[PDB]
């Protein structure tokens, strides 16, 4: 039963570390996804802008 | 590549989260088994 | 992904730019031709 206490405390100290690391991954995964959405909207702006300049030179061509 | 690789970056970031979730629940039954005996 | 499209499209923007900018120069050359005429 005391060997269990050593084992239980070992996994408990690892489980609380697991809780800390998992949340940190959860914290960064959300921030990465929000910054991902920043990149997703990033091209959408210039994609609209690359093809508006793509069309604006058409009049300046002919 | 480009948005595909960052998608894979998030994808593998999610698999690491997924495997972490497996390890979290794994330890719950381990402590439950320890608390059982 | 997007960045590959971003990189290629901006080159197409630049490449069509270089045609438009060059076309103006030869158009300006035609203007000079009218000046002698």
Tell me about this structure.
The structure is cut from a larger assembly and holds 3 copies of chain A. Chain A is rod-shaped. Chain A has 1 helix and no strands. Chain A is 97% helix and 0% strand. With 62 residues, chain A is mainly alpha-helical. Chains in contact: A-B, A-C, B-C. Chains A and C meet through helix 1 of A and helix 1 of C. It is classed as cell cycle. The entry lists the keywords ssna1, DIP13, NA14, microtubules, centriole, centrosome, mitotic spindle, cytoskeleton, coiled-coil, cell cycle. The entry is titled "Cryo-EM structure of SSNA-1(R18E/R20E/Q98E) filaments".
Name the descriptors.
part of a larger assembly; 3 chains; 62 residues; mainly alpha; 1 helix; Sjogren's Syndrome Nuclear Autoantigen (chain A); coiled coil (chain A)
Topology:
The structure is cut from a larger assembly and holds three copies of chain A.
Chain A: H1 2-61
Organism (chains B, C): Caenorhabditis elegans
Protein name (chains B, C): Sjogren's Syndrome Nuclear Autoantigen
Keywords (chains B, C): Coiled coil
């Amino acid at each position: 039963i005391d060997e269990l206490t050593t084992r239980k405390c070992s996994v408990d100290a690892r489980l609380q570390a697991e809780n800390e690391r998992a949340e940190r991954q959860d914290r960064g995964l959300k921030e990465a996804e929000t910054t991902y959405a920043k990149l997703v909207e990033s091209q959408k702006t210039l994609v609209d802008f690359v093809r508006k300049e793509y069309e604006d030179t058409k009049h300046q061509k002919y | 590549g480009s948005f595909d690789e960052i998608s894979q970056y998030i994808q593998e970031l999610e698999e690491e989260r997924r495997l972490t979730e497996s390890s979290i629940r794994k330890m719950e039954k381990e402590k439950s088994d320890l608390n059982e005996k």
